[PDB]
Amino acid sequence: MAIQRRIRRVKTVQMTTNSPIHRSGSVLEPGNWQEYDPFLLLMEDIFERGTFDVHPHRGIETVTYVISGELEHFDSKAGHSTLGPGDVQWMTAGRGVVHKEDPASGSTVHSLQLWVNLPSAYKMTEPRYQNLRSKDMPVRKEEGATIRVFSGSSKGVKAPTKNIVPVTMVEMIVEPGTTVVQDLPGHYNGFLYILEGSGVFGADNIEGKAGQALFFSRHNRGEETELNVTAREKLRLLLYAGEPVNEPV
Numbered sequence: 001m002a003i004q005r006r007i008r009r010v011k012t013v014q015m016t017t018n019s020p021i022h023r024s025g026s027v028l029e030p031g032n033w034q035e036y037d038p039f040l041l042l043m044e045d046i047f048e049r050g051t052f053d054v055h056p057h058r059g060i061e062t063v064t065y066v067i068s069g070e071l072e073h074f075d076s077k078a079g080h081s082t083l084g085p086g087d088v089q090w091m092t093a094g095r096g097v098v099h100k101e102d103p104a105s106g107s108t109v110h111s112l113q114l115w116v117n118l119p120s121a122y123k124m125t126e127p128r129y130q131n132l133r134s135k136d137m138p139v140r141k142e143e144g145a146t147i148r149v150f151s152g153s154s155k156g157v158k159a160p161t162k163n164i165v166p167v168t169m170v171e172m173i174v175e176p177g178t179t180v181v182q183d184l185p186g187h188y189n190g191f192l193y194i195l196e197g198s199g200v201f202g203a204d205n206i207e208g209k210a211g212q213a214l215f216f217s218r219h220n221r222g223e224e225t226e227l228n229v230t231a232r233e234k235l236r237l238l239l240y241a242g243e244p245v246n247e248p249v
């Protein structure tokens with residue numbers, strides 16, 4: 001029925017040790033806006049308390065998913081918040097904000113940090129912070145799968161998360177042998193990153209396993225497209241797809 005997306009590339013994350021308290025991996029490398037629009041980068045971090053300093057951002061949004069550990073968030077608009085395993089935060093930097101992500105004492109945080117571009121029209125928007133607890137997100141419940149919607153929608157199940165650039169961000173937990181479908185508008189650009197397990201993906205049943213990012217084929221605006229996911233092992237993954245900004249970076 002719907003146009004079936006393909007996996008156009010499979011990236012295997014190569015982690016490096018930054019310091020005794022910090023390891024990291026590039027999932028989406030920086031400086032390739034033209035391929036990843038609206039995304040600017042996606043970084044995997046494993047870190048302890050004291051790793052990061054306070055830093056400004058402007059003209060972007062950052063989206064953190066905590067895989068494990070307890071994270072303390074600060075920003076200069078909203079102040080302090082916390083995140084635990086499975087939780088997300090969405091920080092719109094806009095005209096400017098400073099932030100710091102710091103693990104709780106004795107905790108090691110494993111996280112995924114996504115940057116989303118802001119279009120010129122919104123680069124100077126007021127900073128805003130959204131704390132997105134896993135338990136508060138809507139979920140598509142299917143036989144053998146749950147699809148938790150952190151942003152955008154999945155088969156009409158819509159997160160209330162405020163977006164500037166429309167972004168669909170979903171967490172899938174899929175039992176072995178179960179097939180799940182994610183709908184995407186044809187002009188969205190996206191990928192998924194596998195946290196746990198393995199499966200086959202897209203029109204050609206391309207294999208993917210934990211620690212890999214699988215990038216989606218591009219289609220036309222106005223087309224209804226779908227991505228098929230079949231678990232082989234117990235599968236946990238994050239899918240990110242968004243509307244390209246299409247502006248010189």
Ligand SMILES: [Fe+3]
Pocket residue numbers: 055057099
């Ligand atoms: Fe930062």
